[PDB]
């Protein structure tokens, strides 16, 4: 006769909280994506419990939805907006519409999201046991999930299944931004404070260029994905490469930063190394621009690699775009000749390692010697299976 | 007046010349489409090819007809064909028919305006427009697409192929094999609950050469990996023509699908009692609906020997990394079974050398052996004075 409003009832805060367990039935495919992401995250950061990992995903996705039209939504730039969260999808409705039109659109959205996450699937579901911590309990019992309560008809099981099934469908780089949301939020705060003036740096811990964590100074510029949606990078100025002495453009995997500090202002000597007339110097701008377009390999150095391409090699070069290196002045490669690549030698090697005789890396000597070893030992392995 | 359609109506009295449209695709979309094309081609006769234009045209034709026919009398034909966000007609027709006209017009305007805003270092893909695609792109049957993409063909086609590339493997496979799916759906509708009729089909499923079998379709389902779609059916293959038994066929390994013929009364009485599927067939079919692949699909497993170093490289190199059997962790210094397409295993382990040796299938082994043996000879030759 009178329905509850929230997924879970408000708890007596006077009584100690005891964590209740919710069983979430996940598709084998969603479970296996979450297992993979969890053991990859752990290598950053041991062990994290499945509950903690599922809670991080929920917390990140939720705060981006809740704060979508917030005054401080600059904090959540790049945090994915999951289809399972509904607040953002209501707030996205054209603000210029009359109230009656918005109510009709709101009902159209609630009904279509209900139908989508209410479709019974034929599957062998994996029972995933989420322990609900006090902070998650208070979120799931709050009034701040109004539209989710309506879409999922007050059924926590349905809501959480939808969150984790949607998580599992995101690209690698999207899933990574949910997992490392806390790094992204602190970076977004500093980018806003700094604008174009780059008054301030943050301290951060990096194992990007070291086995042990180094405390370095970063001047953030922009977070980007590679073009294949694999990894997120902070393009920035860093003092790592000169070991504290001066700031140079670089690109850090967001997964290899931790323990980010509040922004502190640079000293006038240091501010004058970075900026002139309160703008990033031409040299920093140029280097940053190179890293925005290639945030994996832009960070390495422009040395010559000599590669002999056959006719077949040029045809393979034309068809295989993944991490494909460039010639001088972005020329087309020439068949049956030595071609000069100016991309970092490591990227040339990662491209032509699958070409064998159709893409023979002649130099530098390093690349020649690694390819010769890979191929001679590989050949011996394949021949061993025949004889 | 001013243009109404993506392309103007052509004078049909003039011989047709295919004009080429340059479509700027994200590197990620292009890489998904060239992989799909290579994998589709492995369904054809040994050395067989499709042009990029033909492959992109098939994707467009499948996605389009599912959108156009979403509410039609014969929409039974398109059950399971993905409805791309790039196509708009279905999204207008999906509006709850029970709403008053004013509410529907408000939702229609909300959808047109929001889809306009959403689809407003590319790989330039040169799509040759065949006569039938030209006549579609110049028809009035893209009313809402013309509004959403402001009459700009480049924008519409980019949206189609970017959305294609975002689908799961099994969704993309259902657009590519739509013609098989449509013929299967026709027979599912005709049969309903009575299963009166079978179709003949050719299977690459359980033979090296195409085998002519009889199928009673039940339902198309995806495996637990969202990799391949299976027709769950009854089939006469296992008893070699003698009787119908529950089975599962990759829709990618069915071809030459015939008209439905009615079963003979001896055969109909093996399959049904009182015009309903016998409990035994129901029970076997139910196991295959929840897992259509496990312990029926043995066909194109890749055997790869990984060293300790191989396992470390497997852990670190995620790009197009193939799926193990049951999604197990790979094991060092032993043969590992990969259930990803043989092409994807080969594109992953071609850079592993002795740390990732593809032992089977025979084709993969012989290509890798040739790549490595001829590669070694090329690198060794450069050390000779």
Author numbering:
A (entry chain B): 2 to 46, 50 to 391
B (entry chain A): 3 to 122, 128 to 392
What did the paper state?
The Type VI-D CRISPR-Cas system employs an RNA-guided RNase Cas13d with minimal targeting constraints to combat viral infections. The Ruminococcus sp. WYL1 (RspWYL1) has been demonstrated to significantly boost Cas13d’s target selectivity and RNase activity (both the cis- and trans-cleavage). Through structural and biophysical approaches, we reveal that the full-length RspWYL1 possesses a novel three-domain architecture and preferentially binds ssRNA with high affinity. Specifically, the N-terminus of RspWYL1 harbors a ribbon-helix-helix motif reminiscent of transcriptional regulators; the central WYL domain of RspWYL1 displays a Sm-like β-barrel fold; and the C-terminal domain of RspWYL1 primarily contributes to the dimerization of RspWYL1 and may regulate the RspWYL1 function via a large conformational change.
